[PDB]
Design a binder for this molecule. Structure first.
Ligand code: 88S
Ligand code: 88S
Ligand code: 88S
Ligand code: 88S
Ligand code: 2B4
Ligand code: 2B4
Lengths: 330, 330, 327, 330
């Protein structure tokens, strides 16, 4: 054989990848997560899983054809979860997605049912993985993945408000003529309608925007900064109406979180985690708060100082999620 | 205003971009080119142009929402070509795309008519740009864009066989257990059915695969390496049959060419250029040959030493393209 | 010729050129950091020591296969610097063991009287990025000699002091420095100002959880973090003889904002006359918006009376030195 | 404490580095390797080792102060090898360096004595490490590291001719007006005076330069391409004469090898390995040949087809290296 005339083999290697990432779901979200991760050189192996055989195979082949331009030596796919074995990070993007005008909370039963099959299959092949939930409603589905997996809470993460906060920083950046990297602001709670903008922490170079404008984010704000939060809430609905779905921004948001996990950065991200014991919350509610994210997942939570109105809005987001969460059939 | 209390302006904002890229067409190919370019930090401004208003705005908005994770501070869109002003590179992806069982050659009348509108509008606003043609049939469309634009031939580049060669290299790599970066091989001629695998130049570490196996690429080959070229030819059709279209690999192949142009690398790529005067070709045929690509586009053409059968196959590819090209009216 | 048998030539100025003046440890660290961040299509090096200059250029050229900067050039002659978008000056006497950066001033001013007109002659529209010490005074000096408008004369200033501060804050908290926010302003030296009022994690003011933060009465003595920021260069000089790596990375950070027109905010040296309560033509670090045209805007930081007094003291210290200087 | 007021700890330590690199020696080569590795984001932890305490601490601190600009969250140092624990790769740059007019082969006795201390201390704390030898004479020192460590051959690599080949490609590129990435050519054998330019493999886009000029690399060559290999041989001495030492190009060459290892790329590099059994070599000689490099080090060797003259020059290099090997006192 030609391979043998050209090359002399020294050993049969173990082959087990050291930085493998699995993406579950090859829809628009899943593929945007896949491309972003490949262009960030985060993994030595990428695995894709879906239920539509043709689409899964087509997507895998199309990424594979770009291998020359990448540094991810192995790209694989299968409907069988054995393809996901030894993943460091498994990203779940599978399930029903919002239609035009549809609340993310409307996807709950359909996605809890899908998660009942997915989660035991992921766990079986990667018992030491970190789970990164992207499927919606993300907060409730992070709780679902946690309960099903049996994993400790540090290893079950939801993409949460990482994108909501990125959108907030982009809009603030556009209003001020400053790059979003130099605009600071936190959107917490549900990744949806009940999210909370933390006006007290909104700043550029550590200068509180609220110290210059005390009415910042209120109805009495002459510049109406609350419309920035309204744009954050409405963004996914506005994008879906225009292009039928969202993909690029969530893909970048997920690869940003994947980078912190894979590279053990210990950067702070507003992501879905259990908030039991914070702000008077007594139940197993999962929603976004600023978390320290690394190789072991969420190791710590930043206790944000909320005004009484900000805390009341966060407890409202918590009540909305727990109302659905507490009555789940699984 | 809050902005003025926070920031003291010391310079009048008369912003002109220095490394602007425009992507014409927001279909799956155009968006894969856009995300790949954004993630490679090649531009300081990205402009998108299309004819479907909603889809165009949705795509622009979705990219802008990922700005925090990028280093391209300005993302814009419009149906109006004034939005593309001062681009250094303009990437053309617009037009009809081949259906399952349809040749890229069959899109020619539809795409020439579209180019008659797009090309003059692009050159009107970006007099310094290089035109990077991606729409199909890419070889005939590069010739068409060249003739319409009034640009010199070095500045009108067709993505051509850069993707066929990357596909070939990936497949060769899979067979050998070597990264595509270390598997060398050139697929030239039409970016389509009549492409030519240059078996004589196929090598690993300077070792000719044809020297070890003389039957390489022929029907007599026991390992059937000709199936690698057949898979290269069939790849877009196979992927279209599986996922409905191709996007990722073409996106990365175009970003690869964009990097060589923007960074003036003078790397060699198999891309569409005028071959009149080479291999006895007498007509104004555009096809892929290894070209040196930099800040002024195609500055030089490498003269590949082809076996008598490889040369005849290349002249056959040229004849096929001329057969379609000679009947065009524009 | 082999080249003509292989290649058919069809077509017989760089667009993103950067020049580094000075091939000392600082200059070479700026050079490697810029090459490894793919910011330039052409890098030029300039120095007065011909052998050292050529050897550094050749050493960089030999790594060309692992880079994406296709032209690396050098000369003692400034004609090599023509068409630079950005010119970084790292040349002159460098900080010595147990000595203030203010002790290099007159010698570096005399050297800039030669360098600056030569840079200006070949790239009249470049952005000048001053790294040489004392950076705040030398930025003012380069501004005066060049005749450039103030937006195009930038000093590396406190970008490194703030980076050191965020690393030290990060080590105490167990958080990546990217998630630890806090600004060190004024002189890139002993009179720098830690802005405790803006120090935060996830928008949470550290002063809100420790009102005494940064003062003598602070039970956790966070003033020691700023003391570590001040002492850092002296400590590194004592141990290894000079500093190079952290400054090269800080300079490449500023070069990225300029070259990619990011409009990110950096604490860098700029003309502060009329701002923050200062009446003289003093340059010091304040948070600036940095892009393709250099410093376009200045962020007006809300400083506490203590912080404002310290910044005024830093301005007074620099003005005092600058006053008694000849050029 | 302020930390406890701001952060709730939820986990539980277990901080084991997953992609750790160690650099032994903090001279100019060791620091150029360190800065290049840091700027390529290859490691989650970087450890430095040396015998000069102040120099080592000052270098560590200077890298640490640049952390905000990096993605390697742990930079450590010590004269104690326990600091290198759990490294995936250990880079050895310690030892005497050659003076002008002094052969790298003259460093043998001083460097072997140093390796007798370093090697057992390195291997002790890192079960999974690959040993990457940079110190000179590199080929002899790779054999020495292999004998002292008791490691299998796949795990002991010498930086060998990776830099000689990069220099060759750079110089070829300069003559042809082509980027080094598109200029192919191998310099094999000893990383020193007896290296072998493989003219038969020298090519652009698969085109053999020797097939265009049969006299290529011989004294009969009108263009004297042999001067390119002479410049490769003399390059370290020319740089040493001008600036006192070489650092940047070797740092980049070592980071290139570290990238193939850390990311399991399976790219081909001309690096020091055992050649017993190839080209009639019957002894345990280490020298550069093209190797497939990945996570388990050198898993495979490319059997380059050499002309009788190239093979004779390669065996001559092996004989020279074997001669020095017979002088080793373990
Ligand atoms: C039992 C099941 N296992 C899977 C696995 C993958 C998918 N795939 C998607 O849901 C892709 C499209 N969805 C979005 N949101 O992109 C569906 C199912 S159902
Ligand atoms: C006169 C015209 N100008 C344009 C500009 C853009 C587009 N957009 C596409 O065709 C994108 C979808 N198609 C593919 N190939 O992705 C069509 C036209 S028609
Ligand atoms: C009239 C003059 N032009 C120059 C240009 C470069 C240099 N080079 C250095 O000073 C490098 C070493 N110094 C530090 N600080 O690294 C000195 C002079 S004097
Ligand atoms: C028993 C010993 N262990 C070590 C470890 C490191 C070093 N360090 C250097 O040799 C740095 C300077 N040399 C080069 N080549 O840069 C020397 C020794 S001696
Ligand atoms: O992936 C491929 O081979 C090519 O992809 C496309 C390139 C440009 C457009 Br517009 C549409 C498809 C092809 O179909 O030629
Ligand atoms: O530039 C080069 O070729 C090489 O550089 C070094 C390699 C290892 C050490 Br330790 C020091 C220098 C060489 O001298 O072999």
């Amino acid at each position: 054989a030609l391979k043998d005339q050209l090359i002399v083999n020294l050993l049969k290697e173990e082959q087990v990848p050291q930085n493998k990432i699995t993406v579950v779901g090859v829809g628009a979200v899943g593929m945007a997560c896949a491309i972003s991760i490949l262009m960030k050189d985060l993994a030595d192996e990428l695995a894709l899983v879906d239920v539509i055989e043709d689409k899964l195979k087509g997507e895998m082949m199309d990424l594979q054809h770009g291998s020359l331009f990448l540094k991810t030596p192995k790209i694989v796919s299968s409907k069988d979860y054995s393809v996901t074995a030894n993943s460091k990070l498994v990203i779940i993007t599978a399930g029903a997605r919002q239609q035009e005008g549809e609340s993310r909370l409307n996807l709950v039963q359909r996605n809890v049912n899908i998660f009942k099959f997915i989660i035991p299959n992921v766990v079986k092949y990667s018992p030491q993985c970190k789970l990164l939930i992207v499927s919606n409603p993300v907060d409730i589905l992070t709780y679902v993945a946690w309960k099903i997996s049996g994993f400790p809470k540090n290893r079950v993460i939801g993409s949460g408000c990482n994108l909501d906060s990125a959108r907030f920083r982009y809009l603030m950046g556009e209003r001020l003529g400053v790059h979003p990297l130099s605009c600071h602001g936190w959107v917490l709670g549900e990744h949806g309608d009940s999210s909370v903008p933390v006006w007290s922490g909104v700043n550029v170079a550590g200068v509180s925007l609220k110290s210059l404008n005390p009415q910042l984010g209120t109805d009495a704000d002459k510049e109406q900064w609350k419309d920035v939060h309204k744009q954050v809430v409405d963004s996914a609905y506005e994008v879906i109406k225009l292009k039928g779905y969202t993909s690029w921004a969530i893909g970048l948001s997920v690869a940003d979180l994947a980078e912190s996990i894979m590279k053990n950065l210990r950067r702070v991200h507003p992501i879905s985690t259990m908030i039991k014991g914070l702000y008077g919350i007594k139940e197993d509610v999962f929603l976004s708060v600023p978390c320290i994210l690394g190789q072991n997942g969420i190791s710590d939570v930043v206790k944000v100082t909320l005004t009484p109105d900000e805390e009341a809005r966060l407890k409202k987001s918590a009540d909305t999620l727990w109302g659905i969460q507490k009555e789940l059939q699984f």
